[PDB]
Structures are given as C-alpha cells and as structure tokens.
C-alpha cells in the first residue's frame, strides 16, 4: 500500500504559517531567503553581557510573539502556548476560515521542551511565598501538551490533539503523525507543525556546554555554515511554523487551492548516541527510504532535499552519508539553517513549509556561507543565487538529539 | 480494515513490567490488588511539614528507583531516564532477553513532563555560579524524549524512538503509537509504556491548587474513591510501567508465550476546556468506539472496562457518560487508581498492564472505597471482593488534562 497505488488517500497541504528571524510573514521570509538574507545577528540582550556568554550570536524573531499578546494572554499561557495561538489563528485565516467537521479535525504540534519558564516561575513563587502562591493555571501552562491543546481548543479539533517530542525532529514528526492520523482514517483535516521557546541565557548556556554551537561572534551572518569546511556548530534561530493538511477530496469540496502534496513520512532511530548522530547515516537514510516507500516513489524521483544541515562537523558529515544511503545524492540540496538558524522543536516544521514553497514556486534559495565545500561530503548544494528548476518531488530531513530520524516526502501539486 | 478481518496483523503482549506504590514486582502488585491492598499512605516527607501542604497523603514507590542507581547514572541521567533504564532492563530480562532485529524494533515511551528537576537545577546552578556551572548533559537529561532515547539506546531499537506527551494519557498513547507503528509495517516488535517523576511539594501544590486532589489526610487508604458518592479528588501514586508488544508471527518465531492481544487504539480530543473534561463524554466515548472499529469488535463484545477513574467529581461523571456513549455500560468496571493512585504520564501504561493481567488470569480486582454508589454514574463497578470470569475483551481508558482521550482495546489470548 502506498500513495502512488491509491493504498493511502491523497493528502495535500492547503495553508502554511510561520514566524522567523527574517519576518513574521512566511511569504516575506521566502522572499528574503531568495534574496540571500540572513536572520542571524549579534545578540544585544542584556543577559549576554551579564553572564559573559561564549555564544553572542542569535536569530531573534523579527516580530516578537508577545507584541501580539494582551495582558490576559500573558497571564494564562506559557510562551509556546502563546506562539501556538498566534500561529493557529493566522493559519486559519489564511485557509479562508473554513467550517470543518470538528470530529474529523486533528491537531499535532511538536515542541522541544514545553512551558519550562512556568516551572521555574512556580518554583520561585513557592520558595518565596509557599504553596498558595502557585497558580491554579500552572499545570495547564507547564504541561508540554499545552501548546497543541490551546490550538485544538482555539480551532475546535476533536479528532485528536497530539504532541510528539523528539528534539530537533519534533516539528517534522508532528507532520508525520498528522499524515498518519489522516491515512489511517481518524481524521480528514489536520493542523500540524512545531513551536519553540525564545533564545535566553539558560538555553544558550545549556547548549553551549554540549559544545555544539558556533562561536563566530564577530561575523553573525557568517556563523552558520552547513556543509562548509569552516563550520563550527549550529546557531540559534527562533521560529514557529504550522501547516494545514487535508485529504484532496476535502480540499476540493471546499474549493481550497493546494500548495503541495504530502505523500509519505518515515520515522526511524539510530540507537547509537544520546546527542551525536550515527556516522554511517544508515538509519537516517532508512527514514528517507521509508518515506519514499509509503509515497510510492523511488530515489530517482527525488529532485530536491531540504537538509537538516545543522552545521556541526559530525552532523553534516553523517547527513551526507544518509542522503547517499537513500540514493538521493543527485538531488539539489538546500540547508535553510544557513540563513534561519536552529529552532529546535519548530525547525522540522518551518523547513517542511519551505519545502512546500520550493515545490510550489519551483525555486530553491541559496545555502548561505557555502564558500569552501568540505572535500568529504560531495553534495549538490544550491548556493550563490536561487536555483529555478522543475522540482517534482522533495524529501525534508530532520534528525534530532536522541537519535530521532524523521523524513517527509512532498510532491508538487 | 481491522484486526478481526485480517486487515491489520495480529499484535500480542509478550511481557510486562512495572514499579508501583505496592511493589517493584508486577506480579506482587497484582496479588496485592486482589487482596485489597492500598499503596497510598501518609507522607512522611520533610516537604509536607515544611510547607504545611493541604495534601499530606501519597503513594511512594515501594522500592525507590535510585536504590538501583550508581554514581554515574545519578549524575548523567534525570529521574525519568533512570526509571526508564531500570524498567527497560527488567522487561527485556522478563521477555527472555531475545535477539530481535534492531531495524524492526521500536520504542514508544510517554511521559508527563520530562527531566524537570534538571531544569530547576540548571536554573539554580547558573544563578549561583554562572553559565559554566550548568551541566554538559543538561540538554540530554532535560529533554522529555530522554527516557525513550535512553531505553532505545539500551535495548538497540532502530525502528523509531518516540515520546508522546498527553498528560494523564501519555502512557496509554505511547502504547497506541507503538501499535500503529507495527500495524503500518514500520516495526515487528516494540517496547512501550510510560514513566513519571516522584511526589514532591511543587507537584502537590500545582495540582492541589486546581482543587483536583483529595484532602482526606486522616484516612490515607480511604482517600481515593473513584465513582464513589463521597469522592473528593485524585491521589498521587508513583509508578512506571512498560510492556513488550510484537506481531503474533514474531512472538511464535522466538517461542514467546503471549499474555494478551492488543487489538486496537482510539485517540480523540474534547476541544472543550484546558483541564476539565467534557461533561457529555461524547469524544471520550468516541475514543472507545474507535478502538473497537480498528479491533473489529462491537460494544457487546466488551466484558471489561479498566476506567480512568481519577476520583474527581467532574472526571468520573464525564467517564460514566463516555462509557454509555460507547455502549459499554454493561461491562464490568474497575478503577485501579482507588488502590494505586494517579501516576500521570505513566498511569495509562500501568493500567494497560493491569488490563492484560485481568484478561490473562480472568479476574478483576475490587475497586477500593466504592461504598456509596453515585446516582448519576450507574456503572457495574467491581467492588468488595475480586470478580472472576472468562473475560474475552477489555477496554483501557485514559482521559488526560487538556482533553486528550485514549482508549486501548485488549483481547484474551
Ligand atoms: C531558540 C530555541 C531555543 C529555546 S530552548 O530550546 O531552550 N526551548 C525553550 C522552551 C521554552 C522556553 C521558555 N523560556 N525559554 C527561554 C524557553 C526555551
Ligand atoms: C507522582 C506523579 C507526580 C509527578 S509530576 O506529575 O509532577 N511529574 C514530575 C516529573 C519529573 C520530576 C522530577 N522531580 N519531580 C518532583 C518530578 C515530577
Ligand atoms: Na530540513
Ligand atoms: Na484505565
């Protein structure tokens, strides 16, 4: 059974929304990327100087979430819940605010951590003034399922509200599970993607102590260098992204113009290391292959790969092998983290949206800072200027800390 | 397409393990439940007196997790990761330490929050001595996928390692996603269940401030009263539980004796309120109905319902209506939280293990403290003494905060 042979129903993407370090509008982010713009700049936050952080570069949201948040929302929601509500409403507006059947409507939103800022706040409030100072809203804000719950409550999703956690692959895995919920018959329509918290001292400190982050502080826009010889780790780039997916029949019934097709989703694991990807990239490649199997495609059909491309030395090397294992080494490769950075749980979702626009507009943006290619890798990396091309099919890769491999297979409508 | 009509492959439960407030051995916990034992006692912890908490009753694990943990594990892992390692090894040994194909082996372990203690630790450390005092493993310990990532690395699962966060239904949802992974053909064997943190002052404060918790401190063992007229909220009971599921062919090939059959799983949502369940129980009942559709069963086939049964006035009323909607109100109902309390993300997995043991031994333990029937409920609640029977099929219910509904359909082997 596959999408090609009619074993699974046809699933199409009908709307996308995203907020990034370049722009709060996905179509503006897309234009910026095509122009070779970067969202990564020098961090001017006071916490950088306070702690004298080794990492002084980051990509803040161009339009911060809380600028669209009144006092009420600031009191009753965690940050990721607030981002979810914002993106949830924008997405629904862009889809024409359709009246769908709630019992056939599901929500699957991934996240890296959850409402962690409310944990420390409640911790502090209890330490200072005792258990009565902990809010009765604390549980619903802290719980990592909260963002998905807020969106499901907002839009009225009654065919399931799910939250997969797989670190960097959470946003892509969310879309994978949304696809599954539809193809198994549990829903006809689904909002899916990923949300994540902002850059701060403690996140910077924590990830910096892993020694996986770039420290090229003097040249922020040149710091993130996926598949480049002079790469020194990943760069934080704040993001949130959701897409609306549904059966082609459902889309056709309400007159929705599809942006792209979601043909298959592959989920595998390494069982190798807690934070480092497997060097051979076999299991990561198997995730790509599995998505092709479910889509009913062969590697030869894959014209484009939106790479995970963290810019860690071992990460990019592993992925290069992974693509080769999947037999997609002839595909045109893009590494959006070169310009948008790493948004952890949201990044798989943001990059899935980018893959949809690639297929829609038939153009791949240039991978920034790809000046001196790494001799070992040997990939067809799109760079210099955007590459216009006849892209029929694409695979979006997302590989998370813990050994989590998610591959999504998309097709041009 | 169903399990009955051969649409899905036959999936069987071949091994179980759990640590509870009654015992570290699942077979001993099971005997205790049949004898009418309770794991809920007066909390002798210092934080109870220190803060003068409204709740002074809880069920700590009989055998603490850390009593099996050395110095490396205590510094390199979070609590839920440590619980995961322990139960992971115990399950594998109970299964006969089989040599499975890692590429067809998956792990799905749910949890409520994650390595939350390491967040407040990192926060305190950084505030005291700056960013360099934060642990290098802070990220891999804090990340909520960490428990599942530990177990997948421990046992060598390469067909996917996933963590669903669904609050009270996390453990059940994990089994649900494990079932899905096997039936869609991505794996043949799967370790699945749930883990959760211990009882502490802040967890108590957070849940008790919602007025969700029982305050019957004078009589700890009589506090948790699911479906009883005089019920006043849930009681904390620490737990962790995992089960080994696999296809019947795979089980037969290695000579593994099945304990029960996993026939189907239904996942729906309320989209009603952030913490309160929907009064009508319609979507909760649809979760039950969906598990039957996929199992290939009818409501008449269901002889047993392992209820969510938290003992909240609102929660039990909703579940009573949900069972009516599913057409399962003539089924024999058991509420294990009466004796084992609420373990949040692990409780759905624990009660799935209890459902398996019920179908294996053909006996339902008594629902503790069910003395005065509530007029509104009108359920056949097993109480006073255990009820023996040739039980053919059972449905395990989990309805978590956020409106997440998971129903698991089990069958006698
Ligand atoms: C730009 C992505 C990095 C953020 S993180 O990976 O540390 N997750 C994260 C999640 C929630 C909150 C709330 N406050 N903060 C600071 C958070 C951080
Ligand atoms: C017995 C179930 C209640 C625990 S909870 O729902 O508050 N989750 C939880 C998870 C992790 C940790 C670590 N320390 N602590 C205290 C934790 C607590
Ligand atoms: Na990607
Ligand atoms: Na149950």
Residue numbers in the entry:
A (entry chain B), B (entry chain A): 4 to 416
What does the paper say about this structure?
In addition, through MoA studies, we identify the M. tuberculosis cellular target of GSK3011724A to be KasA, a β-ketoacyl synthase. Mycolic acids are unique and fundamental components of the mycobacterial cell wall and KasA is essential in M. tuberculosis. The FAS-II system is comprised of four enzymes acting in a consecutive cycle: KasA and KasB, condensing enzymes; MabA, a keto-reductase34; HadABC, a dehydratase35; and InhA, an enoyl-reductase36. The FAS-II system enables fatty acid elongation leading to meromycolic acids (C56), which are then condensed with C26-CoA (from FAS-I) by the polyketide synthase Pks13, followed by reduction, culminating in the production of mature mycolic acids.
Curious to understand the molecular details of GSK3011724A binding to KasA, a 2.13 Å co-crystal structure of the dimeric KasA-GSK3011724A complex was solved. The co-crystal structure reveals that, in contrast to TLM, GSK3011724A uniquely binds within the large acyl channel that normally accommodates the growing meromycolic acid chain, unexpectedly trapping the open conformation of the enzyme. GSK3011724A sits at the branch point of the acyl channel, a feature thought to confer specificity for ‘kinked' unsaturated substrates. Within this site, density for a long linear molecule, modelled as polyethylene glycol (PEG), is also consistently present and perfectly complements the space between the compound and the protein. This sandwich of PEG and GSK3011724A enables the large acyl cavity to be filled, occupying the volume of the branched phospholipid chains previously observed within this pocket. The indazole ring lies across the flat hydrophobic surface formed by residues such as Gly200 and Pro201, and the amide of the sulfonamide makes a key hydrogen bond with Glu199. This anchors the ligand in an ideal position, allowing the kink (introduced by the sulfonamide linkage) to place the butyl chain into an orthogonal narrow lipophilic channel lined by residues such as Ile347, Ile202 and Phe239. Pro201 and Pro206 both lie within the acyl site and are in direct contact with the ligand. Exchange of proline for a hydrophilic serine residue (Pro201Ser) disfavours interactions with the aromatic indazole ring, whereas the Pro206Leu substitution introduces steric crowding of the ligand. An explanation of this finding comes from close inspection of the GSK3011724A-KasA complex crystal structure, where specific changes in the acyl pockets of the related enzymes disfavour the unique binding mode of GSK3011724A.
